Amino acid sequence: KLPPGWEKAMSRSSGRVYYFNHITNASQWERPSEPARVRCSHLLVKHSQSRRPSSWRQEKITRTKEEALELINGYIQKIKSGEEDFESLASQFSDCSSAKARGDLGAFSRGQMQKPFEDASFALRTGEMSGPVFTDSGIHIILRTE
Numbered sequence: 001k002l003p004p005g006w007e008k009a010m011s012r013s014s015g016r017v018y019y020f021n022h023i024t025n026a027s028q029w030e031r032p033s034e035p036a037r038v039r040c041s042h043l044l045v046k047h048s049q050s051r052r053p054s055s056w057r058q059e060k061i062t063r064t065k066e067e068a069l070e071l072i073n074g075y076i077q078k079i080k081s082g083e084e085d086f087e088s089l090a091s092q093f094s095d096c097s098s099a100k101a102r103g104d105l106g107a108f109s110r111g112q113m114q115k116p117f118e119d120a121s122f123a124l125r126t127g128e129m130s131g132p133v134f135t136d137s138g139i140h141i142i143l144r145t146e
């Protein structure tokens with residue numbers, strides 16, 4: 001009956017059915033098929049409306065939400081095409097401290113993370129990646145590793 005969050009959609013360019021998850025913002029052609037804790041990595045791109053417009057990459061972050069989303073979308077494309085792997089781009093480009101650990105945050109339970117991140121993380125299956133996930137930190141690509 002489709003895992004939590006999944007809905008059927010219709011491609012605008014091709015007319016082929018696909019599947020969208022309204023929690024994780026994941027999108028796929030393929031038909032998709034709870035734990036105390038999950039382990040995730042992420043790639044955060046902050047923007048000017050981030051709760052803390054600063055990171056290890058740059059002292060003042062001045063890009064807009066729209067520009068941050070553009071970046072996130074491009075990283076997702078590269079990951080999905082296999083041109084770049086998630087861990088490489090998190091290391092180079094994540095506005096999170098966890099960039100130094102290939103975007104790895106370790107394991108966590110419900111009640112620790114900002115709610116959209118958490119909900120997304122818990123709706124992913126092991127191995128799966130999110131689409132853009134919006135929190136007060138910025139915009140995330142989330143990969144569930146455990």
Ligand SMILES: N=C(N)NCCC[C@H](NC(=O)[C@@H]1CCC/C1=C\[C@H](COP(=O)(O)O)NC(=O)[C@@H](N)Cc1ccccc1)C(N)=O
Binds near residue numbers: 096098112
């Ligand atoms: N019950 C709740 N709502 N509690 C609020 C929880 C919020 C917090 N953050 C997040 O949920 C986002 C998603 C994963 C990474 C993250 C934020 C940051 C990077 O984003 P910023 O914080 O610079 O905007 N990451 C990190 O590793 C930490 N150095 C940042 C940090 C978090 C909490 C206290 C001190 C430092 C957390 N406690 O994990």
